[PDB]
RNA sequence: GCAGCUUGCUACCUCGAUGUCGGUUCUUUCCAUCCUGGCCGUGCAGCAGCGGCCAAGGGUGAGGUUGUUCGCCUAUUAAA
RNA sequence: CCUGGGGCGGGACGCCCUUGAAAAGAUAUCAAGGGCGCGCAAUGGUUGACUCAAGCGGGUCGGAAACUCGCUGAAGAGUGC
RNA sequence: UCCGCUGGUUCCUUCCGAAACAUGUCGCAGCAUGACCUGACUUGAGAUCGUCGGUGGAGUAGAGCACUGAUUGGCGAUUCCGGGGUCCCUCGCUCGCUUGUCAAACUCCAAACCCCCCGUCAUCCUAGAAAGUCGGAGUCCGGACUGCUGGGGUAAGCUUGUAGUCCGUAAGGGAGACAACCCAGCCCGUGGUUAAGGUCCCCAAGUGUCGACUAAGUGUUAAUACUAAAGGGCGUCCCAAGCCCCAGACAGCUGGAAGGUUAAGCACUUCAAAGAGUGCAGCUCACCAGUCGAGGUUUGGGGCCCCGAAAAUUGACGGGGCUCAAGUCGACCACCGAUACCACGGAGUACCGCAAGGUAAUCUCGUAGGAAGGCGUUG
RNA sequence: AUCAUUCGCGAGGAUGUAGUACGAAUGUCACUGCCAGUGUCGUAUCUUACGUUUUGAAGAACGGGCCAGGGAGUGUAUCUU
């Protein structure tokens, strides 16, 4: 499961890349979306590598992301009670485990927004002018996206 | 000044490869096409009759009718739909 | 706490071997000092420096 | 007209001489010097250029003259074989008024050379290696590019 | 390669005007130094040259033609 | 009228092809190569029969210049410009 | 009078928001038509700005000589068409084998982008897809940055194109100032954290950490119209490889350059140790012996610095100043720092709902201009 | 913050203390008589006027010395929505 977070703005960005972002539902910086691992989404995330950061999120990171930055319709925070009344699992942690194990989805939750408006990264990040392999933050973090997601908790 | 003729800038659009120059395969000229079938426009430069523009070279046309030997194609040129008359020698079916 | 470092690096348009004897507190610090010294003496980043081994001596 | 004018490569290749008019030919006379028969020279070195530059035919002729004279005075007339690999194929045209109808007349030819492309190849004996190398050094001083010598044959024969 | 001190190229500023050449007057500036000061080389005997380096404190004038700039010519002058 | 100010020069003032033009399309300059303002009752249509350019070989002053026979020959010819 | 030419054209808010381009024009300071913007209406279910796979178009970069043309030698024959001192024989073209270069009007080859169509995912869509009809225009002086070695040009803050994004019409934060360079697209107030960039002082936060380099005040200048080259350096710091090398080299200190030749040196039988000879006929090196007693020399590839390096009012790393740095290089840590992001409260807008009200990550910038709603004077 | 453990060459990081004490704001109880505002001055940050021609205006481009009043989409006919 790619965890794609936007880290650069929409100024001086080409229309194809900006529409790629818009179909990914990433209109502003510090916005995260969780998407499956099919080749279609892999190509879409590859097209916007210079303006986002993506990786393979683990279950604990997604659990804390749902617990601290999940919003329903009307801008209402997600909690444990809504999860238990609209899913089969014991808490947000078990639902995150199910989502990582592929037998669940984020669309299982009724009314849940597909965009996680995250906080800016605590103690900054590595920079938006170099990729991950150049010492920056853009591009593919692999499993190290969870460190960046943790610092943007 | 430059010209505005129909064959303008078709040095390689309307050129045949070295080992397909000469007579073409005659089976390409009797390929019947159905209504609504998608066919590729790949112009045969040897057949000088019933040819579309070079500007439609490489466009997929939907067959909508027949006008004798040639076929009626609904071709797309940028943002407009065009009706392009082409004989079967210049068309080629799309395979799935 | 002395080390031998083997490898090659991009000395301009070419690649050159090296077995520069480097000493430090441990092996990772030896590798870091290898990268730092080559970035100093030749102005090349760590992508242009390849270390084949770090031999404890 | 200094070589800095027709030096940088920012234009496409103007070489089809059947669609142009009256190119003044190159002053470069020969392209082989020395022993043109002895293929048994063990130590062979080449002068390579390390930029993308257009060498005028007059520059090539001056470099060839200085290198050939140095090699003849160093290793004798038949103790070396020196090859100028590149022909000047590009036609250099100057806008000889103002900028109206600016496509100029051909005022000479030149050779467009890529980075690391050998200009002169010199084959010499073991003892005449240093003289050939130094003459090739003098040859590159008459060229508009930074040039470095590279050894073709007998790298172990020298060191 | 440098300078932007000649002619070009360009059309960025100015056409509800930035008074357009040359001279004169007065002040200043750069050194790529003509003389004055200090050195180095010489195919420097001396005298007098020739070439180069440092150096902008001072000096660098008077006259004939030409509207001239420039340039020529005259006699001085350390140099003009 | 266009015009690296205007004028002199030129017509990039109508039509046609190659490049420019960055492998769909489009793409400017007084950009580069240029051409056209016609010719033909056959230099047109169709059917049949053949294959051309240029070499090598044989043939008598018919020379290394003619015409003729064999071989090579997907085109190196011809198709008005 | 007329003018396509100049100047001026008077209140507020809200919604949306361009074009400086094509064709024709006695057309080039103008206009019409189309693209682009806006408002309304009809229509009734798909649309493609994006991804992945496939059926097709490639003839550009690159590459190459297989065609068209160029282009360099060598080797062996055109017994022939040709040039020269019994056509005795010289002999350049021409044809093959092996080399050396090319093309914008060359291609046996040949990408990455890209374009048409199909399937899938994705997004938009009955709160109205694509299509259609009508009302209103503005607009056809554009410019810049990043690419295309774009074309031309000696080059140009030159001129003329193309793809994207900007300024125009773009705030706020930062580069010293900066139309268009980076963050950023922005309703109001508060709190927090970050972006770009910076942390010696001017100035909030580092006289921060590790490993080296620079000795020149070099530098303290991302992009750039704002930044000097060729050439050279036994300046200094590195990597690698030949050669001599504790069976004793390199550089210094002791006996000789004695046989020879005056082949007028400077126009050997055989010895470890003496030439047809380095130097101001003795005056001097190359060379063997001894000697301190250990590295020496050559080449190649690199980093920084230096010479090359001269301009005009006194002056510009932004200034002070800075030398194991306050400079350069390879990494790292912590903090500072926006109106961005998060949160809270509030305003406006869009659509839906009978209404209460609901939704908005997928609403809030704005020139020419379209549309809507209001304030004011006189009657 | 402090303290403890551990890692890190080091600057520092991780873990726990602790999502604790705090924290915009929303209420309530004391306490106090000034506060909002107005004029001027100073300190800190930001801004080179307005309209126009302009690709680009603070321009060494054009307009205004200042103040008051006057000063620019109106009617007929016709066509269209
Ligand atoms: Mg005119
Ligand atoms: Mg090419
Ligand atoms: Mg930009
Ligand atoms: Mg804009
Ligand atoms: Mg700004
Ligand atoms: Mg408006
Ligand atoms: Mg304007
Ligand atoms: Mg009034």
UniProtKB/Swiss-Prot annotation, chain A:
Sample GO molecular function, one term: RNA binding
GO cellular component: cytosolic large ribosomal subunit
GO process annotations (BP): maturation of LSU-rRNA from tricistronic rRNA transcript (SSU-rRNA, 5.8S rRNA, LSU-rRNA); translation
Pfam families (UniProt xref): Ribosomal_L30
Protein name: Large ribosomal subunit protein uL30
PROSITE patterns assigned: RIBOSOMAL_L30
Organism this protein belongs to: Methanosarcina acetivorans (strain ATCC 35395 / DSM 2834 / JCM 12185 / C2A)
Family: Belongs to the universal ribosomal protein uL30 family.
Oligomeric and partner information: Part of the 50S ribosomal subunit.
Keyword line: Ribonucleoprotein, Ribosomal protein
Gene: rpl30
UniProtKB/Swiss-Prot annotation, chain B:
UniProt KW Ribonucleoprotein keyword: yes
One BP annotation, GO: translation
SUPFAM superfamilies (alphabetical): Translation proteins SH3-like domain
Highest taxon of the lineage: Archaea
Pfam families: Ribosomal_L21e
GO molecular function: structural constituent of ribosome
PROSITE patterns, per the entry: RIBOSOMAL_L21E
Gene Ontology CC terms: cytosolic large ribosomal subunit
InterPro entries recorded: Ribosomal_eL21, Ribosomal_eL21_arc, Ribosomal_eL21_CS, Ribosomal_eL21_sf, Translation_prot_SH3-like_sf
Keyword set, alphabetical order: Ribonucleoprotein, Ribosomal protein
PANTHER family (UniProt xref): 60S RIBOSOMAL PROTEIN L21
HAMAP family: Ribosomal_eL21 (MF_00369)
NCBIfam families in the cross-refs: PRK04306.1
Family assignment from sequence similarity: Belongs to the eukaryotic ribosomal protein eL21 family.
The protein's name in its UniProt record: Large ribosomal subunit protein eL21
Species annotation: Methanosarcina acetivorans (strain ATCC 35395 / DSM 2834 / JCM 12185 / C2A)
Swiss-Prot record, chain C:
Alphabetic keyword roster: Ribonucleoprotein, Ribosomal protein, RNA-binding, rRNA-binding
HAMAP family: Ribosomal_eL20 (MF_00273)
A Pfam family: Ribosomal_L18A
Subunit structure and binding partners: Part of the 50S ribosomal subunit. Binds 23S rRNA.
Family: Belongs to the eukaryotic ribosomal protein eL20 family.
Keyword Ribonucleoprotein: yes
A Gene Ontology molecular function term of the record: large ribosomal subunit rRNA binding
GO biological process, one term: translation
Name of the molecule in the record: Large ribosomal subunit protein eL20
InterPro entries: Ribosomal_eL20 (IPR028877), Ribosomal_eL20_dom (IPR023573)
Annotated Gene Ontology cellular component terms: ribonucleoprotein complex; ribosome
UniProtKB/Swiss-Prot annotation, chain D:
InterPro entries per the UniProt record, alphabetical: Ribosomal_uL16, Ribosomal_uL16_arc, Ribosomal_uL16_CS_euk_arc, Ribosomal_uL16_dom, Ribosomal_uL16_euk_arch, Ribosomal_uL16_sf
NCBIfam families membership: PRK04199.1-3, PRK04199.1-4, uL16_euk_arch
Protein's name in the database: Large ribosomal subunit protein uL16
Gene Ontology cellular component list: cytosolic large ribosomal subunit
Family of the protein in this entry: Belongs to the universal ribosomal protein uL16 family.
Gene3D superfamilies (alphabetical): Ribosomal protein L10e/L16 (3.90.1170.10)
HAMAP family cross-referenced by the UniProt entry: Ribosomal_uL16_arch
Swiss-Prot/TrEMBL GO biological process terms: translation
PROSITE patterns xrefs: RIBOSOMAL_L10E
Record's keyword terms, sorted: Ribonucleoprotein, Ribosomal protein
Parts forming coiled coils: none
UniProt GO molecular function: structural constituent of ribosome
Ribonucleoprotein recorded as keyword: yes
């Amino acid at each position: 499961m790619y965890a794609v977070v936007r880290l650069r703005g929409q100024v001086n960005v080409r229309y194809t890349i900006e529409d790629t972002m818009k179909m990914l539902r990433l209109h502003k910086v510090n916005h995260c979306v969780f998407v499956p691992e099919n080749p279609h989404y892999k190509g879409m995330v590859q097209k916007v590598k210079d303006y986002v950061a993506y990786g393979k999120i683990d279950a604990k990171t997604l659990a804390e992301v749902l617990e601290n930055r999940g919003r329903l319709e009307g801008d209402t925070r997600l909690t444990e009670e809504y999860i238990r009344e609209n899913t089969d699992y014991d808490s947000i942690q078990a639902f995150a485990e199910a989502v990582i194990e592929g037998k669940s989805s984020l669309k299982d939750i009724p009314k849940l927004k597909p965009v996680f408006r995250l906080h800016p990264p605590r103690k900054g990040h590595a920079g938006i002018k170099r990729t991950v392999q150049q010492g920056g933050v853009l591009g593919n973090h692999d499993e190290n996206i969870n460190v960046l997601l943790h610092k943007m908790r | 000044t430059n010209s505005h003729g129909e064959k303008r800038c078709t040095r390689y659009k309307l050129q045949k490869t070295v080992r397909e120059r000469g007579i073409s395969p005659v089976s390409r000229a009797i390929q019947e096409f159905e209504e609504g079938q998608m066919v590729h426009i790949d112009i045969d430069p040897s057949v000088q009759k019933g040819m579309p523009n070079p500007k439609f070279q490489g466009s997929t046309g939907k067959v909508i009718g027949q006008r004798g030997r040639s076929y009626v194609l609904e071709v797309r040129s940028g943002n407009a739909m065009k009706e392009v008359f082409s004989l079967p020698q210049h068309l080629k079916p799309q395979k799935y | 706490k002395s080390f031998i470092v083997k490898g090659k690096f991009k000395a301009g348009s070419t690649w050159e071997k090296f077995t520069k004897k480097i000493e430090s507190q441990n092996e990772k610090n030896a590798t870091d000092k290898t990268y730092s010294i080559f970035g100093s003496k030749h102005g090349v980043k760590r992508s242009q420096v390849q270390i084949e081994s770090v031999a404890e001596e | 007209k200094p070589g800095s004018m027709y030096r940088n490569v920012r234009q496409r290749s103007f070489t089809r001489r059947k669609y142009m008019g009256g190119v003044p030919g190159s002053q470069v006379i020969h392209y082989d010097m020395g022993d043109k028969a002895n293929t048994s020279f063990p130590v062979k070195i080449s002068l390579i250029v390390e930029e993308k530059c257009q060498i005028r035919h007059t520059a090539l002729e001056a470099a060839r003259i200085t290198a050939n004279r140095h090699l003849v005075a160093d290793t004798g007339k038949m103790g070396f074989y020196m090859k100028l690999r590149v022909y000047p194929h590009e036609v250099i045209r100057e806008n000889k008024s103002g900028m109206r109808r600016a496509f100029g007349k051909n005022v000479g030819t030149a050779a467009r050379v890529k980075p690391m492309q050998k200009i002169f190849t010199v084959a010499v004996e073991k003892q005449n290696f240093k003289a050939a190398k130094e003459a090739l050094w003098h040859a590159g001083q008459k060229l508009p590019t930074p040039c470095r010598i590279v050894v073709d044959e007998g790298a172990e024969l020298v060191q």
